[model samples]
Target: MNIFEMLRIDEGLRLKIYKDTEGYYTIGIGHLLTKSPSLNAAKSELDKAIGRNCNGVITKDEAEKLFNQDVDAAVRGILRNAKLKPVYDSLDAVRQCALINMVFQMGETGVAGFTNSLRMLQQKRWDEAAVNLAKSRWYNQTPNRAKRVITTFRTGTWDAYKNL
Candidate 1:
């Protein structure tokens, strides 16, 4: 099964995944969602969440480096793979970055599901795009995050993008 399937995440969980800025991948939370009985098992689960080949599991001491590098790489990878020329041709730099940030957090497949919003964006229908963005499960589930991104897309400002 894919990660989403293994995680048993519905739309709500997918939005929660995007809001996980702390990047805490503890196994108990992802697996059992309750108190873990043993420290070894907890650590092992966290290790799995970190991915076994992730250049030694990150500790609090290494959080800064790991967070920056991993998030940047993930964002770049998503943008590169998506080849969002249609988006870029229509949006400004700040708007493009804001959309990319959402996709980075949610994954490409999840972002691709925003068909109506993407169609509006491609058509340069800014108002419709903003409204459609607000109508997403992501927006309903993550009000603050969706607000920030939608505001950026609406105003073409860098405020939300900068903070993110």
Candidate 2:
């Protein structure tokens, strides 16, 4: 589905989480095989899922399936929260996706912590929302990703996060 397409553009597909990647101990489609601190170790949790000498060979179809299943759970978590339902319902597709994308990146509860951003969104104060979104530890940790997410909400463009 286009949902995976939406997410994939921002997260270039890397079947395995290695030293240079962000997943830490993740696997196909950023699925956390286990959050074990070790990387590429034979006894690590990820090793049980794939193998010790992981080559990270996930096909796009397989990755798409996992993304859909996981995102479904994330969306349910976001929508189930009474406070976010209205905010979610009021958004246009791009903004809605921005919300969903945020929820997926930072668990539903983590995104709920963006009170200012969510409030600004409810008020249609996109500038404030964008600013609030950029003011977090997440922003400090990943400025490029911050710029992408901020730009998406700031411009309300469907294509914002798709760029590398």
Predicted structure with the largest TM-score when compared to the true one: 2
Candidate 1, which segments miss by more than 4 Å at Cα?
A: 1-42, 45-61, 82-85, 159-164
Query: Against the hidden reference, what TM-scores do the models get?
Result: 0.59, 0.80
| Top candidate when judged by lDDT against the true structure | 2
* lDDT score at residue 3, model 1, on the 0-100 scale: 18
Regions of model 2 farther than 4 Å from truth: 17-23, 38-57, 162-164
Error of 2 at 4 (Å): 2.1
In order, what lDDT does every prediction score?
0.54, 0.70
Clash pairs for candidate 2: none
Q: Summarize candidate 2's per-residue lDDT along 1-164 as a digit string, tens digits.
A: 25566667656666645432454555566565545565545135544554344454555666566677778987898789877788998887777777777777777888888888888999999888888888899889878767777777777885564444
Score candidate 1 by lDDT. Answer: 0.54
